[PDB]
Design a protein around this ligand. Structure first.
Ligand SMILES: O=P(O)(O)O[C@H]1[C@@H](OP(=O)(O)O)[C@@H](OP(=O)(O)O)[C@@H](OP(=O)(O)O)[C@@H](OP(=O)(O)O)[C@H]1OP(=O)(O)O
Ligand SMILES: [Mg+2]
Ligand SMILES: [Zn+2]
Lengths: 504, 290, 49, 45, 167
């Protein structure tokens, strides 16, 4: 926070308004909430912000952020970028023509009724589902058909009391489509809600083939890339007078986890090592092996949460071949998981190591069909979670198949992020994956480093934590070089980053 | 080496993957920078100067890097990123960076509010080196709003920011000059009148030149009236520089416009001003010649 | 509820026209020299057009 | 509380010029109140 | 909420006067006995839209007789300027708690009349009308903005919150 000439009387006295102005801009989704006592509602001038009073300090901050019609310019850039995505993928999606409605210069900031943004003309016919959330998967593109699609973009500026944008997008859709003033040139379309105060986005509407992944990707790229949004975020930072300290823009590349640590859940599943056999020879020359217990690994890194669903070989009796029936178990098990889950830990997208195992759990997860399932393009060393002493022996000597839960983020969420705790974790997991031995000696450097019995890892300080980050990553690079004949000074910043992180 | 090499030779045969790893090692060197050196600057300038049109697809990458640096906490890296913008300014456009050169335009119009002279000067430099490539009448902040923003900076009493500000205003008053109102030019005249006391001589010569340009855009008579009243000041080195300025106004807009007013002012009974008139005629006959 | 348009932005007119406010840091208005079509100028011109 | 519609504050050079001029009027006043026939202000001030 | 309604009750009981005096004007008879007033039986909603139109006309006549061309009062009774106003107009065009208290009371009645107009035009419902009326009366605070002209309203506004809680 932000580490001659001769002045007239009223310059040499009277307060300085700028630090008050920036305290109000910072605390502003609270000072400007919606659930108030008495207060008469009003629209900020050229935008879609509501005030419920007259707080001139805050109104000045907000106005000077949105000068020069920045609110509409944001609407116009977002609509253009969606258009261009459709300009390109006409082919795969059967889009014959793409119609951008010549704009009412006030459609963006009229808030109780809507024209539409994008008119979509098929080639032949689309068969179209019922409406669901852009985060829900199971979609039956059966109900109707059409050549006419509309697409809507609605921008809000949320606040502490109300910034859920799923229910915003739902309510705006249901209302605006069953109202009698919004002129929708189709009975089918989609509505896309942006929350500019919290940089959130989602959508609700009637879908057709391709739309879910198409939009999902186009939205996640606009929210990161768009230039209007960039000018927004940048006036905000400068009116706060906030500076970063990190150089290099920490590891936020258009890769998933800038999507992934979000308040929406995402789970990481490892079932590669649920089946394991331990091998020792007979007096007979044949090296006979005994099956041993396993564990499904479910992870939420925005929490540091593992569900460890340990598999028993109670199921090795009369099931013919191991692997596919193991796929089948994992499937029905995660299904039961979602069944037993309460309404604020329900998962939203679940990514497994086994891209080959999506299908069985795909089908099994229809009792909870909201689940965006995927196979992860970045495999994370939960297979190195077989290595630690607590978890391992737990699984190994368990007799009844069961559940356990760990918080791998021992005490970390007090003085680092979920971002930083996830990154540090990736370091530790890959360190067991690659060495386990240099891992022991790096993460217990001091002779009397200790762990509190409810910890996966010791009680460090920030100093040695930064030192050991560099150390573990030094190790990962050293070992890549050792097993691939490489110079580790040779790699570029992208190469070192991505070898540290995952596949390439 | 690489800089010497490609600067002498050209980058014709540098193939795809080669140029990639090169651009990337470049970005690294420049971030990693830990000294105040023109080493990495000149390296960058040359390398893109030779990549010519080869550089199209990494402009998101290159800028995104530079911008994240422009956000930093410590001044030095901020200033560096402003510099690097001022280098690559020309190719930024020449690859047709609508979104991106538009970016740099408006985002620097943002940072015009800095209060670290060392960054403010470099920002002014980068804006000048953008306006050089992209002319006035397609600038991303229209100079119609730029220059009004610049006038309250001319009061920044620091050699580097003052140098670069008067440079930018001199460009604008030379060529733009009509996206602004007479009244704006008059206020800016009144602010120039006290750049004539900077401790650096480059500033003072730039100031005199822009008095010339303003005399071309607006007529000479009001600027000449504001110069005589300055001759009435004392302390000699701003009297002498206003007398240069009078000579310059007379040279551009023909001397018959100003000679009667000078001669008539030779009658106010004060010393410093009669000598101002005589010295101004000195410079005038030097400048016009035959 | 019952919405309005918050009509007069707070544009220290001494600053905006003459680049200079006598109050300096304490001017309770917005130091801004930006000419730009307003929240009603555009409405009126377009509808008259 | 200052006021709106005002210029700045005079800069030291103008303050100096007018300090000078006021001093000169002070002089003219005293040589008036002392009625001096032995005085001149020359064409150079 | 219970206790604050109890308090209001007790105070009303305690401060009660006998009516203490009488003179006996009858405004409406004094009106009807004059040659300018006629009478009728009409439909409620009709007199409602009537009253709203009449109030709107009165207030607009006031403005435009004061020669304030640059302000215009629209149909939900918001006052809105059509220019940027100089000082002299910023000042000449100021209004006081009388003008604004009528404005906002008229706005309350217009909202009531127009919920009833929606119902009789047939768009809504008997149940939707009743719920909308309940809303309007509980949330007078954030629909009108009368408290800013007679801040002694918050007596009433706290009373309607306490009722809402009870009910
Ligand atoms: O500020 P208000 O006008 O009175 O209304 C709201 C709201 O009212 P509506 O349902 O009428 O829109 C809820 O009140 P209830 O319906 O619950 O009685 C709410 O209550 P909760 O948020 O607690 O559910 C809240 O209360 P509060 O502002 O204290 O949090 C508050 O009603 P009140 O203001 O009457 O409390
Ligand atoms: Mg006063
Ligand atoms: Zn001001």
């Amino acid at each position: 926070w932000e580490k001659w000439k001769k002045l007239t009387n009223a310059q040499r006295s009277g307060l300085n308004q700028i630090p008050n102005r920036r305290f109000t801009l910072w605390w502003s989704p609270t000072i400007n909430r919606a659930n108030v006592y008495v207060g008469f509602q009003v629209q900020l001038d050229l935008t879609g912000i509501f005030m419920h009073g007259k707080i001139p300090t805050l109104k000045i901050s907000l106005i000077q952020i949105f000068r020069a019609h920045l609110w509409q310019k944001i609407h116009e850039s977002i609509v253009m970028d969606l258009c261009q995505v459709f300009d390109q993928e006409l082919d795969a999606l059967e889009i014959e023509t793409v119609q951008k409605e010549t704009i009412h210069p006030r459609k963006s900031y009229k808030m109780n009724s809507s024209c539409a943004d994008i008119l979509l003309f098929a080639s032949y016919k689309w068969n179209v589902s019922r409406p669901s959330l852009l985060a829900d998967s199971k979609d039956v593109m059966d109900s109707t058909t059409t050549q006419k699609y509309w697409i809507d973009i609605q921008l809000r500026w949320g606040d502490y009391d109300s910034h859920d944008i799923e229910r915003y997008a739902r309510a705006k859709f249901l209302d605006y489509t069953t109202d009698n003033m919004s002129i929708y040139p189709s009975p089918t379309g989609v509505l896309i809600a942006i929350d500019l105060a919290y940089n959130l986005h989602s959508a609700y509407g009637n879908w057709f083939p391709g739309s879910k992944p198409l939009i999902q990707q186009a939205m996640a790229k606009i929210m990161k890339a768009n230039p209007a949004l960039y000018v927004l975020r940048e006036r905000i930072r400068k009116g706060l007078q906030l500076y970063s300290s990190e150089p290099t823009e920490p590891y936020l590349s258009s890769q998933n986890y800038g999507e992934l640590f979000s308040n929406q859940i995402i789970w990481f599943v490892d079932d590669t090592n649920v089946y394991r056999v331990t091998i020792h020879k007979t007096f007979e020359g044949n090296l006979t092996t005994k099956p041993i217990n396993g564990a499904i690994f479910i992870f939420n890194p925005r929490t540091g949460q593992l569900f460890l669903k340990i598999i028993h070989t109670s199921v090795w009796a009369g099931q013919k071949r191991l692997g596919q029936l193991a796929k089948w178990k994992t499937a029905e098990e995660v299904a039961a998981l979602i069944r037993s889950l309460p309404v604020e830990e329900q998962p939203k997208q679940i990514i497994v190591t086994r891209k080959g195992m999506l299908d069985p759990l795909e089908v099994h997860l229809l009792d909870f069909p909201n689940i965006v399932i995927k196979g992860s393009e970045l495999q994370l060393p939960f297979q190195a979670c077989l290595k630690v002493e607590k978890f391992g022996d737990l699984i190994l000597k368990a007799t009844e198949p069961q559940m356990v839960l760990f918080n791998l983020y021992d005490d970390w969420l007090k003085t680092i992020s979920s971002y930083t705790a996830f990154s540090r974790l990736i370091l530790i997991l890959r360190a067991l994956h690659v060495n386990n031995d240099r891992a022991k000696v790096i993460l217990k450097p001091d002779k009397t480093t200790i762990t509190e019995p409810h910890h996966i890892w010791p009680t460090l300080t920030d100093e040695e934590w930064i030192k050991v980050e560099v150390q573990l990553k030094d190790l990962i690079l050293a070992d890549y070089g050792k097993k691939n004949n490489v110079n580790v000074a040779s790699l570029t910043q992208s190469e070192i980053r991505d070898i540290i992180l995952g596949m390439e | 080496t690489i800089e010497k090499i490609m600067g002498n030779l050209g980058a014709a045969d540098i193939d795809h993957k080669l140029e990639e790893q090169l651009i990337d090692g470049i970005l690294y060197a420049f971030q990693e920078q830990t000294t105040e050196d023109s080493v990495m600057l000149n390296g960058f300038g040359t390398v893109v100067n030779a990549l010519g049109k080869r550089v199209k697809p990494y402009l998101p990458q290159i800028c995104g890097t530079v911008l994240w640096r422009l956000n930093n906490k410590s001044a030095k890296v901020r200033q560096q990123a402003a510099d690097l913008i001022s280098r690559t300014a020309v190719v930024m456009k020449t690859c047709q960076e609508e979104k991106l050169m538009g970016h740099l335009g408006v985002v620097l119009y943002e940072y015009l509010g800095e209060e670290y002279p060392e960054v403010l000067g470099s920002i002014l430099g980068a804006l000048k080196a953008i306006v050089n490539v992209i002319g006035m009448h397609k600038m991303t902040p229209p100079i119609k709003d730029l220059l009004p923003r610049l006038t309250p900076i001319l009061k920044n009493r620091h050699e580097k920011v003052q140098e670069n500000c008067i440079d930018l205003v001199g460009r604008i008053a030379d060529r733009g000059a009509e996206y602004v109102s007479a009244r704006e030019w008059m206020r800016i005249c009144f602010e120039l009148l006290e750049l004539l006391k900077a401790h650096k001589k480059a500033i003072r010569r730039a100031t005199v030149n822009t008095f010339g340009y303003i005399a071309k855009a607006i007529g000479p008579h009001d600027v000449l009236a504001t110069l005589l009243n300055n001759l009435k000041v004392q302390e000699r080195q701003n009297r002498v520089c206003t007398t240069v300025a009078i000579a310059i106004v007379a040279e551009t807009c023909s001397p018959f416009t100003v000679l009667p007013a000078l001669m008539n002012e030779y009658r106010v009974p004060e010393l410093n001003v009669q000598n101002g008139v005589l010295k101004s005629l000195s410079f005038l006959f030097e400048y016009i010649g035959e | 509820a019952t919405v309005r348009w918050d009509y007069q932005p707070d544009i220290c007119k001494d600053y905006k026209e003459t680049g200079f406010c006598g109050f300096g840091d304490s001017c309770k208005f917005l130091h801004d020299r930006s000419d730009y079509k307003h929240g009603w100028q555009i409405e009126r011109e377009l509808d008259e057009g | 509380g200052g006021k709106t519609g005002s210029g700045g504050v005079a800069s030291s050079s103008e303050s100096n010029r007018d300090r000078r001029e006021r001093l000169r009027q002070l002089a003219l006043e005293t040589i008036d109140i002392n009625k001096d026939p032995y005085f001149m202000k020359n064409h150079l001030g | 909420s219970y206790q604050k309604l109890l308090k209001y009750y007790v105070l009303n009981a305690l401060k009660h006067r006998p009516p203490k005096a009488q003179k006996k004007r009858y405004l409406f008879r004094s009106f009807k006995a004059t040659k300018f007033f006629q009478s009728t039986k009409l439909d409620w909603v009709e007199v409602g839209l009537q009253v709203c139109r009449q109030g709107y006309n009165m207030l607009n006549l006031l403005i435009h007789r004061k020669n304030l061309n640059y302000l215009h009062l629209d149909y939900n009774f918001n006052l809105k300027p059509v220019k940027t106003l100089t000082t002299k107009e910023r000042k000449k065009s100021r209004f006081g708690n009388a003008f604004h208290l009528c404005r906002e009371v008229l706005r309350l009645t217009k909202l009531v009349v127009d919920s009833h107009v929606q119902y009789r035009l047939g768009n809504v419902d008997a149940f939707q009308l009743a719920d909308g009326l309940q809303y309007i009366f509980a949330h007078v605070g954030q629909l009108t903005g009368m408290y800013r002209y007679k801040y002694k309203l918050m007596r009433q506004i706290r009373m309607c919150k306490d009722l809402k809680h009870l009910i």
